[PDB]
Amino acid sequence: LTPNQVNDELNKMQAFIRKEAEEKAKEIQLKADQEYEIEKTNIVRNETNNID
Amino acid sequence: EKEEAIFRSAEMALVQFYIPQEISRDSAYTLGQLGLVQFRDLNSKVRAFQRTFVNEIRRLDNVERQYRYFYSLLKKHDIKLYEGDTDKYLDGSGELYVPPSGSVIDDYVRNASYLEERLIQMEDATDQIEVQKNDLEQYRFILQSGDEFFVNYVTGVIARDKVATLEQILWRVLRGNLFFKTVEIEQPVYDVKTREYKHKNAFIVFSHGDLIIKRIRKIAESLDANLYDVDSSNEGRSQQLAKVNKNLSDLYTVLKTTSTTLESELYAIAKELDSWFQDVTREKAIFEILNKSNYDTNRKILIAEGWIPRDELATLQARLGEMIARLGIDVPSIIQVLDTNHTPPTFHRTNKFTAGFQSICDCYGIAQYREINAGLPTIVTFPFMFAIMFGDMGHGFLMTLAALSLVLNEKKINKMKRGEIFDMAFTGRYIILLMGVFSMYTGFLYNDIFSKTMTIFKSGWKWPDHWKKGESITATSVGTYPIGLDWAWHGTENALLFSNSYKMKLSILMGFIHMTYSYFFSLANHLYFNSMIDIIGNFIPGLLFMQGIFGYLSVCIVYKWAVDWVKDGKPAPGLLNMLINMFLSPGTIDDELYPHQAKVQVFLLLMALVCIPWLLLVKPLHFEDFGDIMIHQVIHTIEFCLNCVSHTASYLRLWALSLAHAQLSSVLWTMTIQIAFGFRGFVGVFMTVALFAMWFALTCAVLVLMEGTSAMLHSLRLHWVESMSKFFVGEGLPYEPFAFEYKDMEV
Amino acid sequence: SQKNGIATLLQAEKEAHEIVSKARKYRQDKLKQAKTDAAKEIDSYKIQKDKE
């Protein structure tokens, strides 16, 4: 529309993609926590069973 | 919101696009309807396999091959292809004329890939089921001869074409000892090698020797033969007949069943296959055209460039209002004009009434950017040229009759199929109208209607009380027709030798006026460019050289038209005698057109000639210098200096054709009407009828068709090589916005 | 745009890549933490059984 507005369609979409990737990464960190949980529980179970 | 066709040209722009990648197809549906949109193909120096869209093109190729097979299987059957009126809904200029189509394109691919084998496996059965039926039926008639005799014996059936030779070779290979009786095939049947109803015969044979049996068996096949086996007993043959007869009703019915399926599904598919054809074509084309842009995974945006008109940015934004309406992502502007160093394309608009006129404008060639187009010159001059080619009242009126019929029937002709000979005819239906409406006027001044004249006005001419022909009779003038020429020039060769001289001058004068008018547009575009630094430095000689001679000759010509010479002591100077004097003499005219003109004609000539090298010095004075440009301007100087006179000379063909038409019309009239004048009411009326009919046959056919066909192309000459020589001094590449269109039967 | 898009869009895209790779390296450090967590669970409970 207005020529001066051509920077807004850049910066707002920059923010939109940034927040998309930010949510993706912040849930990937939760996935990392879940991986932590399972690979901790299974290893400790397997070792402690022989200890028992 | 357009151009004036005289000074205002088309003005446009280019930008770098930053469109989101996800709405590529979405944007394409919209801009593909009517957007005045073209792309600068940055996707260059790349191969098909070097491109990121080769995968879908082969899929659409396979489905269109499937559609071609659909064409084939359709036309090979009597059913007619229904075509709905949806093409009008799909061809035209609107606002959302192409509604967006979902991604069910792959569903179309799927169901097509399904139907292909669905129909192949169902159709490839009849070819067998029929031959099995035929073979069983043949076996049946073979067995029908159970009471005809005379492993242990051989049975078969052969065409009558070899019955005699076969029986003879049997008789002369088994050595004259055999039983061989036969019965003919009543109501024969077709063969299988050539599908031909060949007359047939069946035979029966018996012998004692088994060696004989094997010899017969292994000789029969070498020739056109069929083999079978039959029981010797009689009731055994009856049981064979019953068992082989039981299993043929199924064969009789299966073909009917498969047909019932075939036509049933053909009816349904026909309603949609035609539409889907052009539909899927639209998707392949739109994918292709969008594919010319550059994309990488680097950025979510898509790197694209294209070349867009500049006087419709507001309309483009409003139309993209839909982009932000339903599929909105809030990146509205994708337009930002930058600058380049290459010449922009040239393009303009067209209209229904000007289908033919505008085509011929760029058929010769396109003009460069902001270079004036000769639309109005084509509208005016070419029709007037054709009109002045010939002006018989009857011929012009008759030609216009067809034009009126075509224009009034255009209500349905616009939609009905245009015949091979009618395509171009319908293309320029509005041109012949102008042709004729100017032809009737041009011929009006000639006062010719099939070489006749009713003496509309009065001029007054002097004759004695009585006069016997064979003598030259002088009639003085007291005022001629205010409009046109008087009837007095309908007499002997004097009239023709005056009319030819009169007419050969106006042609030259009008040609000079027309070429001056065309050259007048030279500085128009340069002012449009504001390129006045040195362009006038070349327009000046190109004007003065031609004018100082041609305008001087024209003004001299009109000078005698005003002043008489019989009443003046000075005799009338020759029509063209002021040429040699300008060079051999230092100013001596010897024609005495005007005293003072003698001392100024050479002066005008010497100003005219002196600036010959004024063009070869201006170019090097720019600072720098390079050989090709001096060579180019030298060749331009010489070519123009010769082209002025070439054009001057070329204008006589107009009058040559005019007088040729007049003479042929006169001679045809003389050889038709005078012959028809045979006075007889018992057999002469029928002779008059026949002559009248053939006179129409010739007038309409050969005194119009060939003449007009030649005249239009001679006018095309007279327009092109004259105007465009110095008018279209540049070339611009065409603009062709991507848009939907219909497709139909073809390879 | 061009006078600013080449920079703003790069800020968006490389920022997204940086945060995503930050999540990835977080998950790798998290895998190391899971290994050492199984270790510390078998470094204490293993001897805890003998304590009881």
Short mmCIF file of N, CA, C and O in Angstrom, two decimals, chain B residues 476-478 560-572:
data_model
loop_
_atom_site.label_atom_id
_atom_site.label_comp_id
_atom_site.label_asym_id
_atom_site.label_seq_id
_atom_site.Cartn_x
_atom_site.Cartn_y
_atom_site.Cartn_z
N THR B 476 -15.79 25.29 -75.00
CA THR B 476 -15.15 26.13 -74.00
C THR B 476 -15.82 25.96 -72.65
O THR B 476 -16.99 25.57 -72.55
N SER B 477 -15.07 26.28 -71.60
CA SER B 477 -15.52 26.08 -70.22
C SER B 477 -16.00 27.40 -69.64
O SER B 477 -15.33 28.43 -69.77
N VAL B 478 -17.17 27.36 -69.00
CA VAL B 478 -17.70 28.49 -68.25
C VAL B 478 -17.93 28.12 -66.79
O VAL B 478 -18.71 28.76 -66.09
N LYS B 560 0.56 26.83 -61.39
CA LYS B 560 -0.08 26.86 -62.70
C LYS B 560 -1.57 26.58 -62.61
O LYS B 560 -2.34 27.10 -63.43
N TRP B 561 -2.00 25.76 -61.65
CA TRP B 561 -3.42 25.48 -61.50
C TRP B 561 -4.22 26.76 -61.28
O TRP B 561 -5.38 26.84 -61.72
N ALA B 562 -3.63 27.75 -60.62
CA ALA B 562 -4.34 29.00 -60.35
C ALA B 562 -4.30 29.92 -61.56
O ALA B 562 -5.34 30.30 -62.11
N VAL B 563 -3.10 30.30 -62.00
CA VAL B 563 -2.95 31.26 -63.08
C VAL B 563 -3.12 30.55 -64.42
O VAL B 563 -2.49 29.52 -64.69
N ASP B 564 -3.99 31.10 -65.26
CA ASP B 564 -4.13 30.63 -66.63
C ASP B 564 -2.97 31.14 -67.48
O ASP B 564 -2.17 31.97 -67.06
N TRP B 565 -2.89 30.61 -68.70
CA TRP B 565 -1.82 30.98 -69.62
C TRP B 565 -2.30 31.35 -71.01
O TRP B 565 -1.57 32.03 -71.74
N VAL B 566 -3.50 30.92 -71.42
CA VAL B 566 -4.03 31.33 -72.72
C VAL B 566 -4.21 32.84 -72.76
O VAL B 566 -3.87 33.50 -73.75
N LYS B 567 -4.76 33.42 -71.69
CA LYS B 567 -4.94 34.86 -71.61
C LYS B 567 -3.64 35.61 -71.36
O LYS B 567 -3.60 36.83 -71.56
N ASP B 568 -2.58 34.92 -70.95
CA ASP B 568 -1.30 35.53 -70.68
C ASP B 568 -0.35 35.31 -71.84
O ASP B 568 -0.36 34.25 -72.48
N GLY B 569 0.48 36.31 -72.11
CA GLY B 569 1.45 36.19 -73.19
C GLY B 569 2.41 35.03 -72.98
O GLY B 569 2.81 34.38 -73.95
N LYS B 570 2.78 34.76 -71.74
CA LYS B 570 3.67 33.65 -71.45
C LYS B 570 2.94 32.34 -71.68
O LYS B 570 1.88 32.12 -71.08
N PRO B 571 3.44 31.44 -72.53
CA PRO B 571 2.79 30.14 -72.70
C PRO B 571 2.96 29.28 -71.46
O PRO B 571 3.87 29.46 -70.65
N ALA B 572 2.06 28.31 -71.33
CA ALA B 572 2.08 27.43 -70.17
C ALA B 572 3.36 26.61 -70.17
O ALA B 572 3.62 25.89 -71.15
#
